[PDB]
Amino acid sequence: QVQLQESGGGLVQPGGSLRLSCAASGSVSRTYVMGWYRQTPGNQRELVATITSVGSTNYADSLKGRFTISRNTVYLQMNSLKPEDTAIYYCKYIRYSPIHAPLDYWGQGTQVTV
Amino acid sequence: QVQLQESGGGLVQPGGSLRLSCAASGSVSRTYVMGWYRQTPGNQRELVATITSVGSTNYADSLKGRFTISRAENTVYLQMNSLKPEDTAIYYCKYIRYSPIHAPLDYWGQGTQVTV
Amino acid sequence: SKPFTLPILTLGELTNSRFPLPIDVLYTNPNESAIVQCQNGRCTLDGELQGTTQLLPTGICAFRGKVTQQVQDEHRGTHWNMTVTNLNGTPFDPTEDVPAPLGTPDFSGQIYGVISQRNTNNLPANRAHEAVIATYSPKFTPKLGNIQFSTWETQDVSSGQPTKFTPVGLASVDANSHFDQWTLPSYSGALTLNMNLAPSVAPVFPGECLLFFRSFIPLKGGYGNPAIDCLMPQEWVQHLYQESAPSLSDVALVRYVNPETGRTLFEAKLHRNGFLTVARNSAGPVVAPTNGYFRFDSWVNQFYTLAPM
Amino acid sequence: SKPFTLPILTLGELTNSRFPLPIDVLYTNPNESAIVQCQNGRCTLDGELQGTTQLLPTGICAFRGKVTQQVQDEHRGTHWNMTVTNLNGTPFDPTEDVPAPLGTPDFSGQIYGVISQRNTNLPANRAHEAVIATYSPKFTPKLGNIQFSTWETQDVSSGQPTKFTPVGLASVDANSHFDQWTLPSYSGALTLNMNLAPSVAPVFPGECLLFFRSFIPLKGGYGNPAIDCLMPQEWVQHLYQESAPSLSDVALVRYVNPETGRTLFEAKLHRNGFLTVARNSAGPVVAPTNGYFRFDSWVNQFYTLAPM
């Protein structure tokens, strides 16, 4: 029962930057993970950046620090973008509980074109 | 909320015998104690005989085996033998309801007069 | 209120709470007239530790502290004075409301074990030696923060260094070794009264006997088969302390159950202050499977007559 | 499902599951590498005992059996051969699916203790200091036989009930082969260990194993040796009894200050019964000993641990 609302994205010039926003509502949990994945056609959906309920971050090591995630509601800052970063970006919410197995929730996705 | 139905009282000649029966219904328990007390005018109500749910007996140390209690779950019988005028009393059935989740609860019957 | 429970550990899965030993057998003795007032393995059914009882199985009859000096004593061997701390290393406060530091032995005798040391600062120097602590000695004053131990080793014991006593058994049970599992030490020595003791325990009813968890304890030498009887195993102490369930009467009815057959072997009363009684037409070790366990069945009272074992 | 729980015992209320010692500190070391495959203190989160793990604190590194005879050996001292039974006194069945009798020591070294005897039927008694070299080709507990050595030359009886009470290590010098992460050869030289509990490691690169560490006594020599266990004996006893279903591969636990109620750090408790943390610091964890681990939720690999 988690609903995910995404925003931002769109067209950007090479070397440019933009900032993605995702917000979660419904049956949120005290302990959770929130973040973004991205996918282009024929490639796998890949982790970009995630953050836990106590603020712990994880980044794709291929990004080389060009991206930063922060905070429920989260924001992704994307710097020094390259045409290879062109993709569809998806918000993900993982709901954790002491009394059930982890549950995943996905956003509708937002297109980013560099 | 344990209901006790007593029976077998009334008048008896000396040397006679009677059998009291007590039956429990309502909120009965797996582990319990059942038995009889008696009270005579001017005296405290004192134990006669009791028995537990696994059959362990306790007798007033004065009956000297003249009475027998026995058990049909939640049911006991008191066999009253060789009766004497001194045994004239009101006899009360007692049920003790034991539980893992509450303190013990006592229930008493209305009492049955035995007149020797 | 939170429901009262016991662990589901079997007899072969329990340890003694008065000496570091496995439980060997269940035991009664209708002939024993001692006052039963042990201070380890004391815990109420709603989880209150009493006497010198603490939670660590490694803490039972253990000491921690430092040697102050070599001393002279009537006993044979080499003798050492040792200041004792709490087992967690903090200084022992004699004004706290305990009989002695938690874990202190609660019986008269010569406790046999190993004294080991690790020097303060890596690569510090170490030594360990066999040692004996006579709990009946006037130098046995753990409530005063000081005890005495003796070694066969004559010289190799360092002063002012961290010192550990690991109990192993008894040195002796001869007459001059004064073994009596029901005689408490004088925790403060001569001319003093023991304080904050856990109360003595006894059957309320005639025809009921105390039921003990018995372990046989090793001997360094001599003849005999000494045993230590505890009121509850250490795992029950640990379980009750954590659970802290309200006690709904003065006595809990427990059944000793065979898990294989599911049937009840006998029944017992577990009293609120933490001990068992039974009705038994026999004496000595109980003949029952070691894979049996006690199951809590209900809160009862004095009107519940126990079935004979 | 039956809810997963941990005991509410604090760090000063726990004991080691690999040697009879109190837990002294929590410990990680990012500078230390080893294959971690200890066999005592092994229990899954849903209560399955593994390796040589049993429930009694008195059974850890303990032996019981009978001395068969005095023997000759290259090592210094007097040497004795001992048949070993199960700790409950029943004969050990080598065909059972365990690495060795339950309680058998799970590391290489010279284990120092006391051997005690009570003759079969006021029987005679004796006890002496003793050492068991778990690296010796004569250490074959899976075959129902081990060897121990004494300083005492003669006073050990054959065919009498014999108990080994462990106390510490004899030595950790260069010739003593102490390595807590090297398993004994339970059936001796020309055989492979069987039925082992699996090796454990962090799934993530930035994570380290978190141990419950105890310092172990020494008979002589120099050093401050320690024994690290994956979970304390009380957790093994708790999990065995509860046997709660595991709802994911990893449980999130928080180390909490019971006085203040605040979280000091967090860790992953994996299904196979071990802890990991994200820590760059090394050595003993600086935290109060009155803290305890509290189960907060079932998580998975996507939950990044906070640095401690």
Short mmCIF file of N, CA, C and O in Angstrom, two decimals, chain C residues 138-223:
data_model
loop_
_atom_site.label_atom_id
_atom_site.label_comp_id
_atom_site.label_asym_id
_atom_site.label_seq_id
_atom_site.Cartn_x
_atom_site.Cartn_y
_atom_site.Cartn_z
N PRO C 138 37.98 -17.89 58.58
CA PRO C 138 37.75 -16.51 59.02
C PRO C 138 38.35 -15.48 58.05
O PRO C 138 37.99 -14.30 58.12
N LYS C 139 39.21 -15.92 57.14
CA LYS C 139 39.77 -15.02 56.13
C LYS C 139 38.89 -14.96 54.89
O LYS C 139 39.18 -14.22 53.95
N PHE C 140 37.81 -15.75 54.88
CA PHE C 140 36.86 -15.69 53.78
C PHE C 140 35.87 -14.57 54.05
O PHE C 140 34.85 -14.77 54.73
N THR C 141 36.19 -13.37 53.56
CA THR C 141 35.35 -12.20 53.82
C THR C 141 34.96 -11.43 52.56
O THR C 141 35.24 -10.24 52.45
N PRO C 142 34.29 -12.11 51.61
CA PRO C 142 33.97 -11.44 50.35
C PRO C 142 33.08 -10.20 50.50
O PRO C 142 33.22 -9.26 49.72
N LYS C 143 32.19 -10.17 51.49
CA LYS C 143 31.35 -8.99 51.70
C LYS C 143 32.21 -7.80 52.14
O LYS C 143 31.84 -6.63 51.94
N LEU C 144 33.37 -8.09 52.73
CA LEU C 144 34.31 -7.04 53.14
C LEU C 144 35.31 -6.73 52.02
O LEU C 144 36.21 -5.93 52.21
N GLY C 145 35.14 -7.37 50.86
CA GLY C 145 35.97 -7.10 49.70
C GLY C 145 37.31 -7.82 49.68
O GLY C 145 38.19 -7.45 48.91
N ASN C 146 37.47 -8.86 50.51
CA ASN C 146 38.73 -9.59 50.63
C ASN C 146 38.56 -11.09 50.88
O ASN C 146 37.76 -11.48 51.73
N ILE C 147 39.29 -11.93 50.15
CA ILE C 147 39.30 -13.38 50.42
C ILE C 147 40.72 -13.91 50.40
O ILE C 147 41.65 -13.19 50.04
N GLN C 148 40.88 -15.16 50.79
CA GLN C 148 42.19 -15.80 50.80
C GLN C 148 42.13 -17.12 50.03
O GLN C 148 41.13 -17.85 50.12
N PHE C 149 43.17 -17.39 49.24
CA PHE C 149 43.29 -18.68 48.56
C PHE C 149 44.67 -19.29 48.77
O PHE C 149 45.62 -18.60 49.13
N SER C 150 44.77 -20.61 48.61
CA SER C 150 46.05 -21.29 48.77
C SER C 150 46.42 -22.07 47.51
O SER C 150 45.56 -22.49 46.75
N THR C 151 47.71 -22.25 47.29
CA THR C 151 48.18 -22.98 46.12
C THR C 151 49.17 -24.06 46.55
O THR C 151 49.75 -23.98 47.63
N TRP C 152 49.33 -25.08 45.71
CA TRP C 152 50.46 -25.99 45.88
C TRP C 152 51.72 -25.22 45.44
O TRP C 152 52.75 -25.27 46.10
N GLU C 153 51.59 -24.45 44.36
CA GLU C 153 52.69 -23.61 43.86
C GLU C 153 53.15 -22.66 44.96
O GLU C 153 52.34 -22.02 45.63
N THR C 154 54.46 -22.60 45.17
CA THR C 154 55.02 -21.86 46.30
C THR C 154 55.29 -20.37 46.03
O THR C 154 55.19 -19.55 46.95
N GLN C 155 55.70 -20.00 44.82
CA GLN C 155 56.13 -18.62 44.59
C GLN C 155 55.49 -17.87 43.41
O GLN C 155 55.38 -16.65 43.45
N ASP C 156 55.11 -18.60 42.35
CA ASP C 156 54.76 -17.98 41.06
C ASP C 156 53.34 -17.40 41.03
O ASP C 156 52.51 -17.76 40.19
N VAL C 157 53.04 -16.49 41.95
CA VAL C 157 51.76 -15.77 41.96
C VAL C 157 52.09 -14.28 42.11
O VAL C 157 52.80 -13.90 43.06
N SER C 158 51.62 -13.45 41.18
CA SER C 158 51.95 -12.03 41.20
C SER C 158 50.94 -11.20 41.96
O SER C 158 49.74 -11.50 41.97
N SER C 159 51.43 -10.18 42.65
CA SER C 159 50.56 -9.22 43.33
C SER C 159 50.27 -8.01 42.45
O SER C 159 51.09 -7.62 41.61
N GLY C 160 49.12 -7.38 42.69
CA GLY C 160 48.75 -6.18 41.96
C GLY C 160 48.50 -6.41 40.48
O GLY C 160 48.75 -5.50 39.66
N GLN C 161 48.09 -7.63 40.13
CA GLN C 161 47.76 -7.98 38.75
C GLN C 161 46.36 -8.63 38.63
O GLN C 161 45.95 -9.36 39.53
N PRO C 162 45.64 -8.38 37.52
CA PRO C 162 44.29 -8.94 37.33
C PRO C 162 44.30 -10.46 37.52
O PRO C 162 45.12 -11.17 36.91
N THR C 163 43.38 -10.93 38.37
CA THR C 163 43.38 -12.31 38.84
C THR C 163 41.96 -12.86 38.69
O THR C 163 40.99 -12.19 39.02
N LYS C 164 41.86 -14.07 38.16
CA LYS C 164 40.60 -14.73 37.90
C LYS C 164 40.58 -16.07 38.64
O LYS C 164 41.56 -16.79 38.59
N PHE C 165 39.46 -16.42 39.30
CA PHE C 165 39.29 -17.77 39.86
C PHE C 165 38.25 -18.53 39.05
O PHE C 165 37.08 -18.12 38.97
N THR C 166 38.68 -19.63 38.41
CA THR C 166 37.78 -20.51 37.68
C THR C 166 37.47 -21.75 38.53
O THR C 166 38.37 -22.55 38.78
N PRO C 167 36.22 -21.89 39.00
CA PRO C 167 35.92 -23.05 39.85
C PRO C 167 35.87 -24.34 39.05
O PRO C 167 35.47 -24.31 37.88
N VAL C 168 36.33 -25.44 39.65
CA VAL C 168 36.32 -26.76 39.02
C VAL C 168 35.61 -27.82 39.88
O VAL C 168 34.90 -28.68 39.34
N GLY C 169 35.81 -27.78 41.20
CA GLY C 169 35.17 -28.76 42.08
C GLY C 169 35.48 -28.48 43.53
O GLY C 169 35.56 -27.32 43.93
N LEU C 170 35.61 -29.55 44.32
CA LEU C 170 35.99 -29.46 45.73
C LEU C 170 37.39 -29.99 45.91
O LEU C 170 37.79 -30.93 45.19
N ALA C 171 38.15 -29.44 46.85
CA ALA C 171 39.49 -29.95 47.13
C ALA C 171 39.44 -31.30 47.85
O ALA C 171 40.29 -32.16 47.66
N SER C 172 38.45 -31.41 48.73
CA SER C 172 38.31 -32.53 49.68
C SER C 172 36.92 -32.53 50.27
O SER C 172 36.21 -31.51 50.19
N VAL C 173 36.49 -33.68 50.80
CA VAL C 173 35.29 -33.69 51.63
C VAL C 173 35.60 -34.37 52.97
O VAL C 173 34.70 -34.84 53.67
N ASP C 174 36.87 -34.40 53.36
CA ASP C 174 37.16 -34.99 54.65
C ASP C 174 36.66 -34.06 55.76
O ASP C 174 36.31 -32.90 55.50
N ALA C 175 36.67 -34.55 57.00
CA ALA C 175 36.07 -33.82 58.11
C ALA C 175 36.67 -32.42 58.30
O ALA C 175 35.97 -31.47 58.61
N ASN C 176 37.97 -32.28 58.05
CA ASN C 176 38.59 -30.99 58.27
C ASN C 176 38.40 -30.03 57.09
O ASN C 176 38.88 -28.91 57.14
N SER C 177 37.70 -30.48 56.06
CA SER C 177 37.47 -29.63 54.89
C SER C 177 36.07 -28.99 55.01
O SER C 177 35.70 -28.15 54.21
N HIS C 178 35.28 -29.47 55.98
CA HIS C 178 34.01 -28.84 56.36
C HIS C 178 33.03 -28.59 55.21
O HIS C 178 32.46 -27.49 55.09
N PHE C 179 32.83 -29.60 54.37
CA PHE C 179 31.84 -29.49 53.30
C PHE C 179 30.43 -29.67 53.83
O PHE C 179 30.10 -30.69 54.44
N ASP C 180 29.60 -28.65 53.66
CA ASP C 180 28.16 -28.76 53.95
C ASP C 180 27.45 -27.82 53.00
O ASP C 180 27.52 -26.60 53.15
N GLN C 181 26.76 -28.39 52.03
CA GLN C 181 26.16 -27.58 50.99
C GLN C 181 25.05 -26.67 51.54
O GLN C 181 24.66 -25.73 50.86
N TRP C 182 24.55 -26.93 52.76
CA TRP C 182 23.50 -26.09 53.35
C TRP C 182 23.98 -25.16 54.46
O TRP C 182 23.17 -24.46 55.06
N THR C 183 25.27 -25.13 54.74
CA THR C 183 25.79 -24.16 55.70
C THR C 183 26.36 -22.97 54.92
O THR C 183 27.26 -23.12 54.10
N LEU C 184 25.79 -21.80 55.13
CA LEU C 184 26.25 -20.60 54.43
C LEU C 184 27.60 -20.17 54.97
O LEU C 184 27.88 -20.34 56.15
N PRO C 185 28.45 -19.59 54.09
CA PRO C 185 29.65 -18.96 54.65
C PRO C 185 29.26 -17.74 55.47
O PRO C 185 28.17 -17.21 55.27
N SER C 186 30.14 -17.30 56.37
CA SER C 186 30.01 -15.98 56.98
C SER C 186 30.67 -14.95 56.07
O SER C 186 31.90 -14.77 56.10
N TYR C 187 29.86 -14.31 55.24
CA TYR C 187 30.38 -13.45 54.18
C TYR C 187 31.26 -12.29 54.70
O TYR C 187 32.08 -11.77 53.96
N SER C 188 31.05 -11.86 55.94
CA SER C 188 31.91 -10.82 56.53
C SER C 188 32.83 -11.33 57.63
O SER C 188 33.35 -10.54 58.41
N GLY C 189 32.99 -12.64 57.76
CA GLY C 189 33.91 -13.14 58.76
C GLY C 189 33.32 -13.24 60.16
O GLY C 189 32.10 -13.26 60.35
N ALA C 190 34.21 -13.31 61.14
CA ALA C 190 33.82 -13.57 62.52
C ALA C 190 32.97 -12.45 63.10
O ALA C 190 33.09 -11.29 62.69
N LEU C 191 32.11 -12.82 64.05
CA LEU C 191 31.27 -11.87 64.78
C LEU C 191 30.35 -11.00 63.92
O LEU C 191 30.05 -9.87 64.30
N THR C 192 29.88 -11.52 62.80
CA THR C 192 29.02 -10.75 61.91
C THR C 192 27.80 -11.55 61.47
O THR C 192 27.82 -12.78 61.51
N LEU C 193 26.74 -10.86 61.07
CA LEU C 193 25.55 -11.55 60.56
C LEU C 193 25.43 -11.35 59.05
O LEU C 193 25.66 -10.25 58.54
N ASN C 194 25.06 -12.41 58.34
CA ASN C 194 24.85 -12.30 56.91
C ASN C 194 23.66 -11.38 56.62
O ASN C 194 22.67 -11.39 57.36
N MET C 195 23.77 -10.60 55.55
CA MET C 195 22.77 -9.58 55.23
C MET C 195 22.08 -9.81 53.90
O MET C 195 22.65 -10.41 53.00
N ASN C 196 20.85 -9.31 53.78
CA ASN C 196 20.12 -9.33 52.50
C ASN C 196 20.00 -10.72 51.93
O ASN C 196 19.95 -10.89 50.71
N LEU C 197 19.93 -11.72 52.81
CA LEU C 197 19.84 -13.10 52.35
C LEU C 197 18.51 -13.38 51.69
O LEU C 197 17.48 -12.86 52.10
N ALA C 198 18.55 -14.21 50.67
CA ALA C 198 17.32 -14.81 50.15
C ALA C 198 16.75 -15.71 51.24
O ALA C 198 17.49 -16.37 51.97
N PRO C 199 15.42 -15.73 51.36
CA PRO C 199 14.85 -16.48 52.47
C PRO C 199 15.05 -17.99 52.36
O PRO C 199 15.24 -18.51 51.27
N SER C 200 14.97 -18.67 53.50
CA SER C 200 14.95 -20.12 53.54
C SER C 200 13.67 -20.62 52.89
O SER C 200 12.69 -19.88 52.82
N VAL C 201 13.71 -21.85 52.38
CA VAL C 201 12.56 -22.45 51.70
C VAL C 201 12.18 -23.80 52.33
O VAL C 201 13.04 -24.55 52.82
N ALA C 202 10.88 -24.09 52.36
CA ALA C 202 10.39 -25.35 52.90
C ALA C 202 9.00 -25.67 52.37
O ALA C 202 8.25 -24.78 51.98
N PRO C 203 8.62 -26.96 52.38
CA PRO C 203 7.24 -27.28 52.02
C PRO C 203 6.31 -26.65 53.06
O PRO C 203 6.66 -26.63 54.23
N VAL C 204 5.18 -26.09 52.63
CA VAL C 204 4.20 -25.59 53.59
C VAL C 204 3.46 -26.78 54.22
O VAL C 204 3.12 -26.75 55.40
N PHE C 205 3.22 -27.80 53.41
CA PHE C 205 2.49 -28.99 53.84
C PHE C 205 3.33 -30.15 54.33
O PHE C 205 4.43 -30.42 53.82
N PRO C 206 2.81 -30.86 55.34
CA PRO C 206 3.41 -32.14 55.73
C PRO C 206 3.12 -33.12 54.61
O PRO C 206 2.04 -33.06 54.02
N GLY C 207 4.05 -34.00 54.30
CA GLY C 207 3.86 -34.95 53.22
C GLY C 207 4.25 -34.39 51.85
O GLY C 207 3.99 -35.01 50.82
N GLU C 208 4.87 -33.21 51.84
CA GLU C 208 5.49 -32.71 50.62
C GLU C 208 6.97 -32.58 50.93
O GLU C 208 7.34 -32.28 52.06
N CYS C 209 7.82 -32.81 49.93
CA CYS C 209 9.26 -32.65 50.08
C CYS C 209 9.78 -31.66 49.03
O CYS C 209 9.18 -31.52 47.97
N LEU C 210 10.87 -30.98 49.35
CA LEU C 210 11.58 -30.16 48.38
C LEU C 210 12.11 -31.08 47.29
O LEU C 210 12.59 -32.19 47.59
N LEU C 211 11.99 -30.65 46.04
CA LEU C 211 12.52 -31.37 44.88
C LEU C 211 13.72 -30.59 44.36
O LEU C 211 13.58 -29.39 44.03
N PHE C 212 14.88 -31.24 44.26
CA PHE C 212 16.11 -30.56 43.88
C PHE C 212 16.57 -30.98 42.49
O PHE C 212 16.28 -32.10 42.03
N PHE C 213 17.28 -30.07 41.83
CA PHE C 213 18.07 -30.37 40.64
C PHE C 213 19.50 -30.64 41.12
O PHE C 213 20.20 -29.74 41.57
N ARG C 214 19.92 -31.90 41.04
CA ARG C 214 21.18 -32.35 41.63
C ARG C 214 22.31 -32.54 40.60
O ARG C 214 22.07 -33.14 39.54
N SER C 215 23.51 -32.06 40.92
CA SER C 215 24.71 -32.31 40.10
C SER C 215 25.82 -32.95 40.93
O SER C 215 26.03 -32.58 42.07
N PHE C 216 26.56 -33.88 40.36
CA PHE C 216 27.70 -34.42 41.11
C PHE C 216 28.94 -33.58 40.82
O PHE C 216 29.20 -33.23 39.66
N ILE C 217 29.64 -33.18 41.89
CA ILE C 217 30.74 -32.23 41.79
C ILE C 217 32.12 -32.94 41.91
O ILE C 217 32.30 -33.80 42.76
N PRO C 218 33.08 -32.60 41.02
CA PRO C 218 34.41 -33.25 41.02
C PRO C 218 35.21 -33.01 42.31
O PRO C 218 34.99 -32.02 43.02
N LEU C 219 36.14 -33.92 42.58
CA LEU C 219 37.02 -33.85 43.73
C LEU C 219 38.47 -33.92 43.31
O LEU C 219 38.82 -34.74 42.46
N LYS C 220 39.32 -33.09 43.89
CA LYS C 220 40.75 -33.16 43.65
C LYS C 220 41.37 -34.45 44.20
O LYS C 220 42.31 -35.01 43.61
N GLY C 221 40.86 -34.92 45.34
CA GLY C 221 41.40 -36.12 45.97
C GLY C 221 40.47 -36.64 47.06
O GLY C 221 39.49 -35.98 47.40
N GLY C 222 40.79 -37.79 47.62
CA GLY C 222 40.01 -38.38 48.70
C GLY C 222 38.84 -39.23 48.22
O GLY C 222 38.78 -39.60 47.04
N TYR C 223 37.91 -39.51 49.13
CA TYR C 223 36.85 -40.47 48.86
C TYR C 223 35.51 -39.82 48.96
O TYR C 223 35.28 -38.96 49.82
#
